[PDB]
Scaffold this active site. Sequence first.
Site, PDB file in Angstrom:
ATOM      1  N   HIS C  41       1.051  -1.254  -0.039  1.00  0.00           N
ATOM      2  CA  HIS C  41      -0.036   0.303   0.072  1.00  0.00           C
ATOM      3  C   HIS C  41       1.185   1.154  -0.119  1.00  0.00           C
ATOM      4  O   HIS C  41       0.786   2.762  -0.648  1.00  0.00           O
ATOM      5  CB  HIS C  41      -1.289  -0.228   0.849  1.00  0.00           C
ATOM      6  N   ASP C  90      -0.875  -7.125   1.198  1.00  0.00           N
ATOM      7  CA  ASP C  90      -0.615  -6.107   2.157  1.00  0.00           C
ATOM      8  C   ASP C  90       0.929  -6.496   2.156  1.00  0.00           C
ATOM      9  O   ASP C  90       1.373  -6.135   2.820  1.00  0.00           O
ATOM     10  CB  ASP C  90      -0.898  -5.579   2.682  1.00  0.00           C
ATOM     11  N   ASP C 186       1.967   0.720  20.062  1.00  0.00           N
ATOM     12  CA  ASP C 186       1.596  -0.110  18.331  1.00  0.00           C
ATOM     13  C   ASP C 186       2.555   0.196  17.838  1.00  0.00           C
ATOM     14  O   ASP C 186       3.743   0.727  17.547  1.00  0.00           O
ATOM     15  CB  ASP C 186       0.280   0.420  18.433  1.00  0.00           C
ATOM     16  N   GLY C 190       3.631   5.339   8.949  1.00  0.00           N
ATOM     17  CA  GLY C 190       5.543   4.729   7.989  1.00  0.00           C
ATOM     18  C   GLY C 190       6.107   4.097   9.281  1.00  0.00           C
ATOM     19  O   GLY C 190       6.955   3.672   8.338  1.00  0.00           O
ATOM     20  N   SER C 192       4.664   1.537   8.649  1.00  0.00           N
ATOM     21  CA  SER C 192       4.373   0.199   7.524  1.00  0.00           C
ATOM     22  C   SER C 192       5.718  -0.021   7.232  1.00  0.00           C
ATOM     23  O   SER C 192       6.755   0.276   6.135  1.00  0.00           O
ATOM     24  CB  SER C 192       3.604   1.125   6.327  1.00  0.00           C
ATOM     25  N   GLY C 193       5.612  -1.797   6.299  1.00  0.00           N
ATOM     26  CA  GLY C 193       6.229  -2.231   5.094  1.00  0.00           C
ATOM     27  C   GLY C 193       7.447  -3.411   5.766  1.00  0.00           C
ATOM     28  O   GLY C 193       8.143  -3.476   5.684  1.00  0.00           O
TER      29      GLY C 193
END
Lengths: 190, 94, 254
Positions: C41, C90, C186, C190, C192-193
């Site tokens: 994404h 994803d 959490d 940013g 992400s991935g």
Amino acid sequence: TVAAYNLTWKSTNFKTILEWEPKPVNQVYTVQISTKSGDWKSKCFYTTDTECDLTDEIVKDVKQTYLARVFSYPAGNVESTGSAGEPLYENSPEFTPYLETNLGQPTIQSFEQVGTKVNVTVEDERTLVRRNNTFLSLRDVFGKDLIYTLYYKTAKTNTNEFLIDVCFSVQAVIPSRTVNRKSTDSPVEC
Amino acid sequence: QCASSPCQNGGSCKDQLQSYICFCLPAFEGRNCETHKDDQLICVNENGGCEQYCSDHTGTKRSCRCHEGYSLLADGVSCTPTVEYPCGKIPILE
Amino acid sequence: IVGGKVCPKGECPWQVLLLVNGAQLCGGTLINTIWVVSAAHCFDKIKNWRNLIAVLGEHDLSEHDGDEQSRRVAQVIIPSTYVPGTTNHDIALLRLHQPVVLTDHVVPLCLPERTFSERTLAFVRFSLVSGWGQLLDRGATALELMVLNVPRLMTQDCLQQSRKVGDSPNITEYMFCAGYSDGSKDSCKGDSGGPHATHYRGTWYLTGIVSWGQGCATVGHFGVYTRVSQYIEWLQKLMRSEPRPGVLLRAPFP
Ligand SMILES: *[C@@H]1O[C@H](CO)[C@@H](O)[C@H](O)[C@H]1O
Ligand SMILES: *[C@@H]1O[C@@H](C)[C@@H](O)[C@@H](O)[C@@H]1O
Ligand SMILES: [Ca+2]
């Protein structure tokens, strides 16, 4: 494929068994147990039993709180919710051995009646808790946490011995317990 | 209550109100000590005792295997880096 | 990363920072000298692909010590079942133009076997997620690499413990949740991935990728990750086969 239900802990003297239902109709189970932040550990692989002895795992730290869950599989398998792609399972209640295990029915061992006094002594009975392949006793695990209670009207001690004067049943007790506070009466003697 | 000698494999029985309790020998567990510890070397059980990869085999012992960059040791369960920077190892901590 | 710690330099050596035009995009994980795993994404907008760049050995974004290596990203491969804007599937796999060089500071994470990963690694309780994303739901992205230990949950537990929400997406078999539902810790935007990485007897293994989220550290919810175990043989067929032309590639999945 059916999820286990009524998962329950049956435990006395640290000897610990998880039981659940239903009896398996073309399905098997595996248990996972773990402390609140340990990894999970499998027991009772693909059994058609509806119980699992978890004693070995829980005696490794009796002060920890354990959760168990029981998985159901077909046939057959090895897969899956479908859905989430994991095994269908269900969770036990939490369990903290040091605080919930049923104290075993003690046994009076000794009644020497010395002078004007009878000295009735209770036995330091072994538990399922091991240190080096060998079994710790009730006194080893509970220390100053465990007292006893004599009927002979009533007395009481926090050693393993009483002493009264001119019938006899005992009672292990852990006062600091929220639940299963009182053992069951020793078999009556005199 | 213990009178029917229900603890198998050498275990002791201690009778209880309305039941009993089996103390098992080191290699056994179960209500009746009927469960063989020596006897569940399978992959879904602590990884077959393998350090990395586990293969179950029809009729025979599970074998252990290793990731690339690693080779199996004499003991048949452990892995050893065969390269300089093995994947998933932290050299600053190594 | 909300609620984590600064990862001491070179203790997350498989950490990748993705930049477009020199601006922060995403995290990724290094799985070998030329292949990085990221989150599809992140590539939903991407104006000019010419300059995609991956940074390895990065730690403190605001300056420049020995260790970083930058590479143009030659290709971004995403599953053909990923649909832009949605949450399922994803994962992205990125071919660097030239390999990085493995050092103290730059090291691949093990891409585990699948059944090892379903059977063993899925029941290791705590795993590490890391990144340079927002340190709080609406706040400032980090500047030193942040790391956080979350517990994994089976999806039934996830579904049971989470507050219901109008229109929140399905947690599928390609996802799992780890984290806390009390609002303290959490992964965040940013992150992400990048990697959720599982330690097992002395070696660390990708088990997941940071994916999506009801906010971050939102009371009543957990972090959701891509379940890397579903894509292992996809990842490997792609790494083994012959380069194709184009920057974005949609490769069939399964
Ligand atoms: C042996 O006998 C006991 C009772 O003394 C019984 O409950 C067991 O199941 C049996 O094997
Ligand atoms: C009772 O304790 C168990 C563990 C075994 O030692 C038996 O042989 C014994 O009688
Ligand atoms: Ca830097």
